[PDB]
Structure 1
Amino acid sequence: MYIVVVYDVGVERVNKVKKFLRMHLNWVQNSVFEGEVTLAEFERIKEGLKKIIDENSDSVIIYKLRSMPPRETLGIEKNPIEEI
């Protein structure tokens, strides 16, 4: 399993979720992280993110892919594909 996590979280609560995912997935651009995970770690990411975030206000989308998808990037590549 491979997932791309994109999120819209109000400031002064974003930095919090950012720190969290930085220890689970790779940071692609602002508000975007992706990486491989185990059916267990996947539950853990969403587990913590479930309380590290405030529903009703924030939004988090977690696409569930089978492998690292190809991508086309414009502008300053927030992170070299190789570096991950």
Structure 2
Amino acid sequence: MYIVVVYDVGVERVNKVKKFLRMHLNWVQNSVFEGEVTLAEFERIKEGLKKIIDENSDSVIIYKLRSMPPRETLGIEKNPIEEI
């Protein structure tokens, strides 16, 4: 299962979640993470995120995709994942 994790966590909290998602998924642009997870690790992410992040303020979206989606990027590509 391939997910792309997008979020809106505001300030003075994000750095611990940003360092969290770097240990599991890849980094594409500012505040966008994607990577290959198993049915166990998806739970680990959402669990860790649930306990690191505070609800009723912030927002996190996780799209559940079957395989690597094609993409067209503009501006500067701070990290390309297309090269695998």
TM-score range, shorter chain: over 0.9
- Over aligned residues, Cα RMSD in angstroms? 1.2
Following the alignment from structure 1 to structure 2, what is the Cα–Cα distance between the partners of residues 2 and 76? 24
The residue that corresponds to 2:62 in the other structure is: 62
Does the C-alpha gap of structure 1 residues 83 and 23 become closer, same or farther in structure 2, counting only changes over 3 Å? farther
The TM-score with structure 2 as length reference comes to 0.95
Identical pairs, percent? 100
Give 5+ residue unaligned stretches, structure 2: none
Give 5+ residue unaligned stretches, structure 1: none
The TM-score with structure 1 as length reference comes to 0.95
Q: What is the deviation of 1:81?
A: 2.4
The residue that corresponds to 1:53 in the other structure is: 53
| 1:1-84 superposed matches below 5 A | 1-82=1-82
Q: After superposition, what is the alpha-carbon deviation per residue over 1:7-36, rounded to whole angstroms, capped at 9, x for unaligned?
A: 000111011110000001001111100010
Q: What is the deviation of 1:78?
A: 1.6
What's the secondary structure of 2:60's corresponding residue?
strand
